[PDB]
Amino acid sequence: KDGDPQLEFKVLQGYRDLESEMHKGRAQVTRTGDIGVAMDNLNAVDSLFNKVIGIKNNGLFAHDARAMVSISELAQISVRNLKFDADEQSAADQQEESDGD
Amino acid sequence: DVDLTEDLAVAKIVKENPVARKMVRYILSRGESQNSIITRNKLQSVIHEAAREENIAKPSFSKMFMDINAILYNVYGFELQGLPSKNNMNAEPLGHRAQKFILLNNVPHSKNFDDFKILQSAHTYEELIVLSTDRDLVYKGVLSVILCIVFFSKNNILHQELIKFLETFGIPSDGSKIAILNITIEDLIKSLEKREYIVRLEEKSDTDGEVISYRIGRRTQAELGLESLEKLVQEIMGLEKEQTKSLHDDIIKSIGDSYSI
Amino acid sequence: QEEVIALFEKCRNKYKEGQKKYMEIDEALNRLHNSLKARDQNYKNAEK
Protein backbone atom coordinates (compact mmCIF):
# COMPACT_ATOMS: atom_id res chain seq x y z
CA LYS A 1 0.00 0.00 0.00
CA ASP A 2 2.80 2.51 -0.58
CA GLY A 3 2.43 3.78 -4.15
CA ASP A 4 0.05 1.65 -6.22
CA PRO A 5 -1.44 3.93 -8.91
CA GLN A 6 -4.45 1.64 -9.29
CA LEU A 7 -5.30 1.84 -5.59
CA GLU A 8 -5.01 5.62 -5.55
CA PHE A 9 -7.15 6.14 -8.63
CA LYS A 10 -9.79 3.65 -7.51
CA VAL A 11 -9.94 5.54 -4.21
CA LEU A 12 -10.44 8.68 -6.29
CA GLN A 13 -13.24 7.04 -8.29
CA GLY A 14 -15.03 5.56 -5.30
CA TYR A 15 -14.83 8.93 -3.58
CA ARG A 16 -16.23 10.76 -6.61
CA ASP A 17 -19.14 8.35 -6.78
CA LEU A 18 -19.41 8.84 -3.04
CA GLU A 19 -19.66 12.58 -3.63
CA SER A 20 -22.48 12.00 -6.11
CA GLU A 21 -24.35 9.72 -3.71
CA MET A 22 -23.83 12.19 -0.88
CA HIS A 23 -25.31 14.95 -3.04
CA LYS A 24 -28.26 12.61 -3.41
CA GLY A 25 -28.44 12.24 0.29
CA ARG A 26 -28.08 16.01 0.53
CA ALA A 27 -31.47 16.38 -1.08
CA GLN A 28 -32.72 13.35 0.87
CA VAL A 29 -31.79 15.01 4.17
CA THR A 30 -33.12 18.36 3.02
CA ARG A 31 -36.50 16.73 2.49
CA THR A 32 -36.19 14.26 5.39
CA GLY A 33 -33.01 14.39 7.49
CA ASP A 34 -31.45 10.90 7.55
CA ILE A 35 -28.34 10.21 9.65
CA GLY A 36 -27.56 6.78 8.20
CA VAL A 37 -26.22 8.44 5.04
CA ALA A 38 -23.75 10.48 7.08
CA MET A 39 -22.53 7.57 9.18
CA ASP A 40 -22.21 5.20 6.24
CA ASN A 41 -20.34 7.75 4.16
CA LEU A 42 -18.04 8.24 7.14
CA ASN A 43 -17.42 4.52 7.31
CA ALA A 44 -16.85 4.29 3.56
CA VAL A 45 -14.35 7.13 3.49
CA ASP A 46 -12.55 5.87 6.57
CA SER A 47 -12.26 2.38 5.09
CA LEU A 48 -10.95 3.75 1.81
CA PHE A 49 -8.43 5.88 3.69
CA ASN A 50 -7.40 2.77 5.60
CA LYS A 51 -6.58 1.39 2.18
CA VAL A 52 -4.80 4.68 1.44
CA ILE A 53 -2.72 4.12 4.57
CA GLY A 54 0.83 3.90 3.31
CA ILE A 55 -0.14 5.65 0.07
CA LYS A 56 0.97 9.28 0.16
CA ASN A 57 -0.54 11.40 -2.63
CA ASN A 58 -1.80 14.76 -1.46
CA GLY A 59 -4.89 14.96 -3.63
CA LEU A 60 -6.37 11.91 -1.96
CA PHE A 61 -5.98 13.55 1.43
CA ALA A 62 -7.53 16.76 0.15
CA HIS A 63 -10.56 15.00 -1.29
CA ASP A 64 -10.88 12.83 1.79
CA ALA A 65 -11.02 15.97 3.90
CA ARG A 66 -13.70 17.31 1.59
CA ALA A 67 -15.61 14.13 2.32
CA MET A 68 -15.00 14.65 6.02
CA VAL A 69 -16.46 18.13 5.96
CA SER A 70 -19.48 17.03 3.97
CA ILE A 71 -20.19 14.06 6.22
CA SER A 72 -19.85 16.13 9.38
CA GLU A 73 -22.41 18.58 8.06
CA LEU A 74 -24.62 15.65 7.08
CA ALA A 75 -24.55 14.25 10.59
CA GLN A 76 -25.13 17.58 12.32
CA ILE A 77 -28.09 18.45 10.12
CA SER A 78 -29.59 15.00 10.52
CA VAL A 79 -29.31 15.25 14.30
CA ARG A 80 -31.04 18.62 14.20
CA ASN A 81 -33.84 17.04 12.15
CA LEU A 82 -33.92 14.08 14.54
CA LYS A 83 -34.36 16.05 17.75
CA PHE A 84 -38.00 16.90 16.98
CA ASP A 85 -40.59 15.80 14.45
CA ALA A 86 -37.19 25.76 10.81
CA ASP A 87 -39.87 24.14 8.67
CA GLU A 88 -39.76 27.30 6.58
CA GLN A 89 -35.98 27.13 6.86
CA SER A 90 -36.44 23.64 5.49
CA ALA A 91 -39.05 24.94 3.05
CA ALA A 92 -37.21 27.93 1.60
CA ASP A 93 -34.26 25.72 0.74
CA GLN A 94 -36.74 23.17 -0.59
CA GLN A 95 -38.45 26.05 -2.37
CA GLU A 96 -35.02 26.97 -3.66
CA GLU A 97 -34.15 23.30 -4.12
CA SER A 98 -37.41 22.35 -5.82
CA ASP A 99 -36.61 25.33 -8.03
CA GLY A 100 -33.35 23.56 -8.78
CA ASP A 101 -34.15 21.07 -11.54
CA ASP B 1 -75.30 45.97 -20.79
CA VAL B 2 -74.48 46.69 -17.15
CA ASP B 3 -70.86 47.19 -18.18
CA LEU B 4 -71.82 49.09 -21.33
CA THR B 5 -74.22 51.48 -19.60
CA GLU B 6 -71.94 51.80 -16.57
CA ASP B 7 -68.94 52.66 -18.73
CA LEU B 8 -71.16 55.04 -20.68
CA ALA B 9 -72.01 56.90 -17.49
CA VAL B 10 -68.34 56.67 -16.58
CA ALA B 11 -67.59 58.40 -19.87
CA LYS B 12 -70.14 61.03 -18.94
CA ILE B 13 -68.43 61.65 -15.60
CA VAL B 14 -65.28 61.79 -17.70
CA LYS B 15 -66.91 64.62 -19.60
CA GLU B 16 -67.01 66.05 -16.09
CA ASN B 17 -63.51 64.71 -15.39
CA PRO B 18 -60.53 64.14 -17.68
CA VAL B 19 -58.66 64.88 -14.50
CA ALA B 20 -59.12 61.27 -13.41
CA ARG B 21 -57.41 60.06 -16.58
CA LYS B 22 -54.40 62.29 -16.03
CA MET B 23 -54.43 61.21 -12.41
CA VAL B 24 -54.16 57.55 -13.19
CA ARG B 25 -51.52 58.44 -15.75
CA TYR B 26 -49.34 59.91 -13.03
CA ILE B 27 -50.45 57.08 -10.73
CA LEU B 28 -49.23 54.33 -12.97
CA SER B 29 -46.12 56.21 -14.10
CA ARG B 30 -45.02 56.81 -10.52
CA GLY B 31 -45.69 53.21 -9.61
CA GLU B 32 -44.20 51.52 -12.67
CA SER B 33 -40.95 53.40 -12.34
CA GLN B 34 -41.13 53.31 -8.56
CA ASN B 35 -43.66 50.79 -7.22
CA SER B 36 -44.87 53.53 -4.96
CA ILE B 37 -47.50 54.47 -2.41
CA ILE B 38 -48.84 58.01 -2.47
CA THR B 39 -49.91 60.34 0.33
CA ARG B 40 -53.31 61.92 0.80
CA ASN B 41 -51.56 65.29 0.77
CA LYS B 42 -50.06 64.57 -2.64
CA LEU B 43 -53.48 63.50 -3.89
CA GLN B 44 -55.25 66.69 -2.91
CA SER B 45 -52.25 68.76 -3.99
CA VAL B 46 -52.29 67.50 -7.56
CA ILE B 47 -56.07 67.75 -7.35
CA HIS B 48 -55.93 71.46 -6.57
CA GLU B 49 -53.32 71.93 -9.29
CA ALA B 50 -55.73 70.27 -11.69
CA ALA B 51 -58.72 72.23 -10.42
CA ARG B 52 -56.79 75.42 -11.17
CA GLU B 53 -55.82 74.25 -14.65
CA GLU B 54 -59.35 72.98 -15.31
CA ASN B 55 -60.50 76.34 -13.92
CA ILE B 56 -63.40 74.51 -12.24
CA ALA B 57 -64.35 74.66 -8.57
CA LYS B 58 -63.11 71.74 -6.51
CA PRO B 59 -65.72 68.99 -6.05
CA SER B 60 -65.76 66.40 -3.27
CA PHE B 61 -62.44 64.67 -2.70
CA SER B 62 -64.33 61.54 -1.70
CA LYS B 63 -66.34 61.92 -4.89
CA MET B 64 -63.18 62.06 -6.99
CA PHE B 65 -61.46 59.11 -5.36
CA MET B 66 -64.53 56.89 -5.59
CA ASP B 67 -65.08 57.93 -9.19
CA ILE B 68 -61.59 57.04 -10.29
CA ASN B 69 -61.67 53.80 -8.31
CA ALA B 70 -64.79 52.77 -10.21
CA ILE B 71 -63.15 53.92 -13.45
CA LEU B 72 -60.15 51.69 -13.05
CA TYR B 73 -62.32 48.85 -11.91
CA ASN B 74 -64.50 48.83 -15.01
CA VAL B 75 -61.30 49.38 -16.97
CA TYR B 76 -58.95 47.51 -14.71
CA GLY B 77 -60.80 45.53 -12.02
CA PHE B 78 -58.71 47.18 -9.32
CA GLU B 79 -59.28 48.97 -6.03
CA LEU B 80 -57.54 52.10 -4.87
CA GLN B 81 -56.90 51.65 -1.18
CA GLY B 82 -55.67 54.21 1.28
CA LEU B 83 -53.62 53.25 4.29
CA PRO B 84 -54.11 53.88 7.92
CA SER B 85 -51.36 56.02 9.36
CA LYS B 86 -48.10 54.74 10.82
CA ASN B 87 -48.97 56.42 14.12
CA ASN B 88 -51.97 54.09 14.33
CA MET B 89 -49.61 51.10 14.10
CA ASN B 90 -47.24 51.80 17.01
CA ALA B 91 -49.44 53.80 19.41
CA GLU B 92 -65.80 51.66 6.26
CA PRO B 93 -63.29 52.57 3.56
CA LEU B 94 -61.93 55.85 4.88
CA GLY B 95 -60.96 56.79 1.34
CA HIS B 96 -60.94 60.55 1.46
CA ARG B 97 -60.04 60.02 5.12
CA ALA B 98 -57.25 57.51 4.46
CA GLN B 99 -53.70 58.79 4.21
CA LYS B 100 -51.48 56.59 1.99
CA PHE B 101 -52.68 55.25 -1.30
CA ILE B 102 -51.96 52.52 -3.83
CA LEU B 103 -53.75 50.20 -6.25
CA LEU B 104 -54.74 46.59 -5.63
CA ASN B 105 -55.35 43.85 -8.19
CA ASN B 106 -58.76 42.37 -7.46
CA VAL B 107 -59.10 39.19 -9.52
CA PRO B 108 -58.57 35.68 -8.19
CA HIS B 109 -56.15 33.27 -9.85
CA SER B 110 -56.64 31.71 -13.22
CA LYS B 111 -54.48 28.78 -12.18
CA ASN B 112 -53.54 27.40 -15.59
CA PHE B 113 -52.58 30.89 -16.73
CA ASP B 114 -50.21 31.62 -13.86
CA ASP B 115 -48.61 28.24 -14.32
CA PHE B 116 -48.20 28.84 -18.03
CA LYS B 117 -46.50 32.10 -17.15
CA ILE B 118 -44.29 29.98 -14.94
CA LEU B 119 -43.56 27.90 -18.02
CA GLN B 120 -42.64 30.85 -20.25
CA SER B 121 -40.36 32.25 -17.58
CA ALA B 122 -38.88 28.77 -17.25
CA HIS B 123 -37.81 28.92 -20.87
CA THR B 124 -36.49 32.37 -19.96
CA TYR B 125 -34.32 31.42 -17.02
CA GLU B 126 -33.05 28.12 -18.42
CA GLU B 127 -31.82 30.07 -21.42
CA LEU B 128 -30.78 33.03 -19.30
CA ILE B 129 -27.28 32.87 -17.84
CA VAL B 130 -24.66 30.58 -16.28
CA LEU B 131 -33.46 41.91 -16.37
CA SER B 132 -35.39 44.73 -14.69
CA THR B 133 -38.43 42.49 -14.54
CA ASP B 134 -36.20 39.66 -13.36
CA ARG B 135 -34.02 42.04 -11.36
CA ASP B 136 -37.03 43.15 -9.36
CA LEU B 137 -38.13 39.54 -9.30
CA VAL B 138 -35.02 38.55 -7.38
CA TYR B 139 -35.42 41.66 -5.26
CA LYS B 140 -38.96 40.63 -4.37
CA GLY B 141 -37.86 37.03 -4.01
CA VAL B 142 -35.34 37.83 -1.33
CA LEU B 143 -38.09 39.99 0.12
CA SER B 144 -40.49 37.06 0.29
CA VAL B 145 -37.84 34.80 1.74
CA ILE B 146 -37.30 37.35 4.47
CA LEU B 147 -41.05 37.63 4.94
CA CYS B 148 -41.18 33.91 5.63
CA ILE B 149 -38.25 34.41 7.99
CA VAL B 150 -40.15 37.02 9.98
CA PHE B 151 -43.20 34.77 9.98
CA PHE B 152 -41.22 31.95 11.52
CA SER B 153 -39.90 34.87 13.60
CA LYS B 154 -43.48 35.76 14.58
CA ASN B 155 -43.20 39.29 13.17
CA ASN B 156 -40.00 39.95 15.09
CA ILE B 157 -36.42 39.16 14.14
CA LEU B 158 -33.30 41.15 14.95
CA HIS B 159 -30.94 42.56 12.38
CA GLN B 160 -28.07 40.12 12.84
CA GLU B 161 -30.32 37.05 12.95
CA LEU B 162 -31.68 38.14 9.59
CA ILE B 163 -28.10 38.65 8.42
CA LYS B 164 -27.23 35.11 9.41
CA PHE B 165 -30.27 33.74 7.58
CA LEU B 166 -29.18 35.66 4.51
CA GLU B 167 -25.79 34.02 4.73
CA THR B 168 -27.82 30.85 5.24
CA PHE B 169 -28.92 31.22 1.69
CA GLY B 170 -25.55 32.08 0.24
CA ILE B 171 -26.12 35.83 0.27
CA PRO B 172 -22.84 37.76 0.31
CA SER B 173 -22.96 39.93 3.41
CA ASP B 174 -19.51 41.22 2.49
CA GLY B 175 -20.88 44.53 1.26
CA SER B 176 -20.34 43.85 -2.44
CA LYS B 177 -22.61 45.16 -5.15
CA ILE B 178 -25.54 42.79 -5.40
CA ALA B 179 -25.24 40.21 -8.16
CA ILE B 180 -27.47 41.36 -11.02
CA LEU B 181 -28.68 44.25 -8.89
CA ASN B 182 -25.25 45.82 -8.34
CA ILE B 183 -26.25 47.32 -5.00
CA THR B 184 -26.13 46.54 -1.28
CA ILE B 185 -28.84 44.62 0.54
CA GLU B 186 -28.93 47.56 2.94
CA ASP B 187 -30.25 49.68 0.10
CA LEU B 188 -32.82 46.99 -0.59
CA ILE B 189 -33.86 47.30 3.03
CA LYS B 190 -34.11 51.07 2.82
CA SER B 191 -36.32 50.53 -0.21
CA LEU B 192 -38.69 48.19 1.62
CA GLU B 193 -38.74 50.89 4.26
CA LYS B 194 -39.66 53.57 1.74
CA ARG B 195 -41.70 50.92 -0.05
CA GLU B 196 -43.23 50.35 3.39
CA TYR B 197 -42.67 46.65 3.05
CA ILE B 198 -40.77 46.45 6.35
CA VAL B 199 -40.59 47.92 9.84
CA ARG B 200 -37.22 48.72 11.40
CA LEU B 201 -37.13 48.97 15.20
CA GLU B 202 -34.14 50.54 16.95
CA GLU B 203 -33.98 50.54 20.76
CA LYS B 204 -31.23 52.10 22.89
CA SER B 205 -30.37 49.43 25.40
CA ASP B 206 -27.74 50.94 27.67
CA THR B 207 -25.71 47.70 27.55
CA ASP B 208 -25.70 46.93 23.81
CA GLY B 209 -26.34 50.33 22.22
CA GLU B 210 -29.01 50.45 19.53
CA VAL B 211 -30.43 46.97 18.93
CA ILE B 212 -32.48 46.65 15.74
CA SER B 213 -35.24 44.19 14.94
CA TYR B 214 -37.70 44.19 12.07
CA ARG B 215 -41.36 43.49 11.45
CA ILE B 216 -43.69 43.34 8.47
CA GLY B 217 -44.42 46.65 6.78
CA ARG B 218 -47.98 47.52 5.88
CA ARG B 219 -47.25 47.56 2.16
CA THR B 220 -46.73 43.82 2.37
CA GLN B 221 -49.33 43.50 5.12
CA ALA B 222 -52.12 44.95 3.01
CA GLU B 223 -50.52 43.01 0.17
CA LEU B 224 -50.38 39.80 2.17
CA GLY B 225 -53.61 37.97 1.56
CA LEU B 226 -54.30 35.25 4.08
CA GLU B 227 -55.47 32.58 1.65
CA SER B 228 -52.89 33.98 -0.74
CA LEU B 229 -50.20 33.36 1.85
CA GLU B 230 -51.51 29.91 2.65
CA LYS B 231 -51.95 28.55 -0.85
CA LEU B 232 -48.61 30.19 -1.59
CA VAL B 233 -47.03 28.00 1.05
CA GLN B 234 -48.89 24.98 -0.30
CA GLU B 235 -47.33 25.73 -3.68
CA ILE B 236 -43.93 26.18 -2.04
CA MET B 237 -43.99 22.52 -1.01
CA GLY B 238 -46.34 21.29 -3.75
CA LEU B 239 -49.00 20.41 -1.23
CA GLU B 240 -52.42 18.78 -1.52
CA LYS B 241 -55.63 19.71 0.29
CA GLU B 242 -54.74 17.37 3.16
CA GLN B 243 -52.62 19.56 5.44
CA THR B 244 -54.77 22.55 4.45
CA LYS B 245 -56.27 23.63 7.75
CA SER B 246 -53.45 22.14 9.82
CA LEU B 247 -50.80 24.25 8.13
CA HIS B 248 -53.39 27.03 8.05
CA ASP B 249 -53.29 27.09 11.84
CA ASP B 250 -49.51 26.63 11.85
CA ILE B 251 -49.44 29.81 9.77
CA ILE B 252 -51.82 31.44 12.23
CA LYS B 253 -49.20 30.61 14.85
CA SER B 254 -46.39 32.01 12.71
CA ILE B 255 -48.43 35.21 12.40
CA GLY B 256 -49.55 35.91 15.93
CA ASP B 257 -49.71 39.70 16.23
CA SER B 258 -47.88 40.10 12.93
CA TYR B 259 -50.74 42.20 11.61
CA SER B 260 -52.71 44.92 13.31
CA ILE B 261 -55.76 42.78 12.65
CA GLN C 1 -49.30 7.89 35.81
CA GLU C 2 -49.97 6.24 32.45
CA GLU C 3 -49.31 9.54 30.69
CA VAL C 4 -46.08 9.67 32.68
CA ILE C 5 -45.46 6.07 31.58
CA ALA C 6 -45.84 7.05 27.93
CA LEU C 7 -43.63 10.11 28.44
CA PHE C 8 -41.02 7.95 30.16
CA GLU C 9 -41.04 5.47 27.29
CA LYS C 10 -40.82 8.18 24.63
CA CYS C 11 -38.00 9.94 26.47
CA ARG C 12 -36.38 6.52 26.80
CA ASN C 13 -36.43 6.16 23.02
CA LYS C 14 -35.23 9.75 22.60
CA TYR C 15 -32.37 9.63 25.09
CA LYS C 16 -31.15 6.14 24.21
CA GLU C 17 -31.33 6.43 20.43
CA GLY C 18 -30.04 9.99 20.22
CA GLN C 19 -27.26 9.10 22.64
CA LYS C 20 -26.35 6.15 20.43
CA LYS C 21 -26.22 8.57 17.52
CA TYR C 22 -24.11 10.95 19.56
CA MET C 23 -21.73 8.08 20.18
CA GLU C 24 -21.75 7.59 16.43
CA ILE C 25 -20.76 11.25 16.32
CA ASP C 26 -18.02 10.61 18.84
CA GLU C 27 -16.53 7.72 16.90
CA ALA C 28 -16.73 9.78 13.72
CA LEU C 29 -14.79 12.45 15.60
CA ASN C 30 -12.29 9.81 16.61
CA ARG C 31 -11.89 8.63 13.03
CA LEU C 32 -11.48 12.15 11.71
CA HIS C 33 -8.94 12.76 14.45
CA ASN C 34 -7.15 9.63 13.26
CA SER C 35 -7.12 11.08 9.73
CA LEU C 36 -5.49 14.33 11.01
CA LYS C 37 -3.20 12.14 13.22
CA ALA C 38 -2.02 10.05 10.21
CA ARG C 39 -2.33 12.21 7.08
CA ASP C 40 -0.79 15.11 8.97
CA GLN C 41 2.20 12.93 9.78
CA ASN C 42 2.29 11.97 6.12
CA TYR C 43 2.51 15.70 5.51
CA LYS C 44 5.32 15.86 8.04
CA ASN C 45 7.33 13.14 6.31
CA ALA C 46 6.63 14.33 2.77
CA GLU C 47 7.28 18.02 3.41
CA LYS C 48 10.37 17.51 5.56
mmCIF file of all heavy atoms in Angstrom, chain A residues 86-88 92-93 95-96, chain B residues 145 148-149 152 169 236-237, unseen atoms left out:
data_model
loop_
_atom_site.group_PDB
_atom_site.id
_atom_site.type_symbol
_atom_site.label_atom_id
_atom_site.label_comp_id
_atom_site.label_asym_id
_atom_site.label_seq_id
_atom_site.Cartn_x
_atom_site.Cartn_y
_atom_site.Cartn_z
ATOM 1 N N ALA A 86 -37.328 27.198 10.641
ATOM 2 C CA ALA A 86 -37.190 25.758 10.811
ATOM 3 C C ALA A 86 -37.842 25.026 9.649
ATOM 4 O O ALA A 86 -37.186 24.720 8.654
ATOM 5 C CB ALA A 86 -37.798 25.316 12.128
ATOM 6 N N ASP A 87 -39.136 24.735 9.785
ATOM 7 C CA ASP A 87 -39.866 24.142 8.672
ATOM 8 C C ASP A 87 -39.788 25.043 7.453
ATOM 9 O O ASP A 87 -39.519 24.582 6.338
ATOM 10 C CB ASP A 87 -41.320 23.884 9.066
ATOM 11 N N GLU A 88 -39.997 26.344 7.653
ATOM 12 C CA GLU A 88 -39.759 27.297 6.578
ATOM 13 C C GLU A 88 -38.294 27.295 6.177
ATOM 14 O O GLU A 88 -37.965 27.320 4.985
ATOM 15 C CB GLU A 88 -40.196 28.695 7.003
ATOM 16 N N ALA A 92 -37.820 26.978 2.518
ATOM 17 C CA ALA A 92 -37.209 27.932 1.600
ATOM 18 C C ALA A 92 -36.084 27.293 0.807
ATOM 19 O O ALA A 92 -35.989 27.494 -0.408
ATOM 20 C CB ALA A 92 -36.691 29.145 2.366
ATOM 21 N N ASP A 93 -35.235 26.515 1.474
ATOM 22 C CA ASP A 93 -34.265 25.719 0.742
ATOM 23 C C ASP A 93 -34.970 24.780 -0.216
ATOM 24 O O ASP A 93 -34.660 24.760 -1.409
ATOM 25 C CB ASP A 93 -33.381 24.937 1.711
ATOM 26 N N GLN A 95 -37.982 25.127 -1.343
ATOM 27 C CA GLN A 95 -38.452 26.047 -2.366
ATOM 28 C C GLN A 95 -37.332 26.367 -3.340
ATOM 29 O O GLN A 95 -37.487 26.218 -4.557
ATOM 30 C CB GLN A 95 -38.982 27.323 -1.720
ATOM 31 N N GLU A 96 -36.180 26.778 -2.813
ATOM 32 C CA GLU A 96 -35.015 26.971 -3.662
ATOM 33 C C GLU A 96 -34.608 25.667 -4.328
ATOM 34 O O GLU A 96 -34.326 25.636 -5.530
ATOM 35 C CB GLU A 96 -33.858 27.537 -2.842
ATOM 36 N N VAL B 145 -38.592 35.685 0.873
ATOM 37 C CA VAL B 145 -37.835 34.804 1.744
ATOM 38 C C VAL B 145 -37.780 35.406 3.132
ATOM 39 O O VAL B 145 -38.075 34.752 4.137
ATOM 40 C CB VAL B 145 -36.427 34.585 1.176
ATOM 41 C CG1 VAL B 145 -35.579 33.847 2.180
ATOM 42 C CG2 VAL B 145 -36.513 33.833 -0.123
ATOM 43 N N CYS B 148 -41.052 35.217 4.998
ATOM 44 C CA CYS B 148 -41.179 33.912 5.628
ATOM 45 C C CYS B 148 -40.331 33.833 6.884
ATOM 46 O O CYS B 148 -40.748 33.256 7.895
ATOM 47 C CB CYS B 148 -40.762 32.825 4.640
ATOM 48 S SG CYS B 148 -41.590 32.917 3.041
ATOM 49 N N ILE B 149 -39.131 34.408 6.831
ATOM 50 C CA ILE B 149 -38.252 34.413 7.995
ATOM 51 C C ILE B 149 -38.948 35.075 9.171
ATOM 52 O O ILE B 149 -39.028 34.519 10.272
ATOM 53 C CB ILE B 149 -36.936 35.136 7.666
ATOM 54 C CG1 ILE B 149 -36.180 34.417 6.555
ATOM 55 C CG2 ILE B 149 -36.087 35.267 8.909
ATOM 56 C CD1 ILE B 149 -34.932 35.144 6.111
ATOM 57 N N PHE B 152 -41.811 32.855 10.554
ATOM 58 C CA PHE B 152 -41.218 31.947 11.522
ATOM 59 C C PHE B 152 -40.614 32.709 12.690
ATOM 60 O O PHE B 152 -40.370 32.117 13.746
ATOM 61 C CB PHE B 152 -40.193 31.044 10.842
ATOM 62 C CG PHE B 152 -40.655 29.623 10.700
ATOM 63 C CD1 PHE B 152 -41.743 29.314 9.907
ATOM 64 C CD2 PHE B 152 -40.044 28.606 11.412
ATOM 65 C CE1 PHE B 152 -42.184 28.010 9.786
ATOM 66 C CE2 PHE B 152 -40.479 27.303 11.290
ATOM 67 C CZ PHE B 152 -41.550 27.007 10.480
ATOM 68 N N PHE B 169 -28.603 31.543 3.069
ATOM 69 C CA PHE B 169 -28.921 31.221 1.693
ATOM 70 C C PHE B 169 -27.907 31.882 0.779
ATOM 71 O O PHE B 169 -28.269 32.504 -0.221
ATOM 72 C CB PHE B 169 -30.338 31.646 1.360
ATOM 73 C CG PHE B 169 -31.338 30.579 1.622
ATOM 74 C CD1 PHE B 169 -31.601 30.183 2.917
ATOM 75 C CD2 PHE B 169 -31.995 29.950 0.581
ATOM 76 C CE1 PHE B 169 -32.511 29.194 3.174
ATOM 77 C CE2 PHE B 169 -32.911 28.959 0.836
ATOM 78 C CZ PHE B 169 -33.166 28.584 2.135
ATOM 79 N N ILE B 236 -45.350 26.261 -2.355
ATOM 80 C CA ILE B 236 -43.930 26.182 -2.039
ATOM 81 C C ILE B 236 -43.508 24.727 -1.915
ATOM 82 O O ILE B 236 -42.461 24.321 -2.434
ATOM 83 C CB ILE B 236 -43.624 26.977 -0.758
ATOM 84 C CG1 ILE B 236 -43.942 28.458 -0.957
ATOM 85 C CG2 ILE B 236 -42.183 26.779 -0.338
ATOM 86 C CD1 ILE B 236 -43.831 29.273 0.306
ATOM 87 N N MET B 237 -44.312 23.918 -1.232
ATOM 88 C CA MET B 237 -43.987 22.519 -1.010
ATOM 89 C C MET B 237 -44.798 21.584 -1.897
ATOM 90 O O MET B 237 -44.735 20.365 -1.712
ATOM 91 C CB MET B 237 -44.199 22.152 0.458
ATOM 92 C CG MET B 237 -43.459 23.033 1.436
ATOM 93 S SD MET B 237 -43.838 22.596 3.145
ATOM 94 C CE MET B 237 -43.293 20.890 3.194
#
